[PDB]
Amino acid sequence: NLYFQGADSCIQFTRHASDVLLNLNRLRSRDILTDVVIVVSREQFRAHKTVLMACSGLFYSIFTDQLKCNLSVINLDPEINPEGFCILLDFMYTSRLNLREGNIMAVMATAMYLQMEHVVDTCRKFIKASE
Ligand SMILES: O=C(O)CCNc1cc(Nc2ccc3[nH]c(=O)[nH]c3c2)c(Cl)cc1[N+](=O)[O-]
């Protein structure tokens, strides 16, 4: 699937961006070219620094710091919920946010810590609606 757009009339591929993420998530599943371990409450999550930086203000700041960009292990605040992190990491790699009544507060807190503004705002709206 392709279509035209812009004063260019440039060809755009509809599924290209989502296909790239699908493939990045496959690399993560197979531990191919992963270059960082994120440690949350003694659980370990392998990932790609570029994907993290593309989705999170916190990770953008870390991995653009000339000192911290060389670390292969990054520890998060030990009060961060690991399920909250796993939900957001999955979101980064898929566009899908598995928000539920039983996890929304943890996910929101985690998204605030990671500086994922669109997710925070979304959690706020869903909390607002249920009051
Ligand atoms: O059967 C295959 O081609 C292997 C399928 N698996 C796979 C494929 C890719 N990239 C890939 C490969 C060939 C392509 N030809 C294209 O036009 N685009 C392509 C993208 C990545 Cl990055 C991870 C995985 N993976 O880890 O599973």
Question: Which structural domains are found in the chain, ordered by start?
Answer: 1-131 (3.30.710.10)
Helix (H) or strand (E) holding 51: helix 49-55
d(C-alpha 111, C-alpha 99), whole Å: 12
DSSP annotation of 125: H
Q: If 0-12 CB within 10 Å is exposed, 13-18 middle and 19+ buried, where does residue 85 land?
A: buried
Tokens of 125: 């709206």
Angle between helices 117-129 and 104-114 (to 10 degrees): 150
C-alpha dist (Å) from residue 120 to 4, 101, 105, 111, 116: 34, 15, 10, 6, 6
Nearest one of 44, 94, 114 to 72, comparing CA atoms: 44
d(C-alpha 46, C-alpha 52), whole Å: 11
Nearest CA to ligand 1 atom 8: 23
17 Cα to the center of ligand 1, angstroms: 14
74 Cα to the center of ligand 1, angstroms: 29
| Residue 94: half-sphere exposure toward Cβ, Cα within 13 Å | 12
d(C-alpha 116, C-alpha 68), whole Å: 20
64 Cα to the center of ligand 1, angstroms: 29
C-alpha dist (Å) from residue 8 to 5, 11, 12, 15, 84: 7, 9, 11, 20, 42
At position 98, the amino acid (one-letter code) is N
Nearest CA to ligand 1 atom 20: 23
Nearest CA to ligand 1 atom 11: 23
* CA 57 and chain centroid, separation: 10
Nearest one of 56, 1, 50 to 27, comparing CA atoms: 50
Is residue 111 a contact partner of residue 119, using CB atoms and an 8 Å limit? yes
- Resolution (Å units): 1.9
Residues flanking ligand 1, CB < 6 Å: 23, 26-27, 30, 32
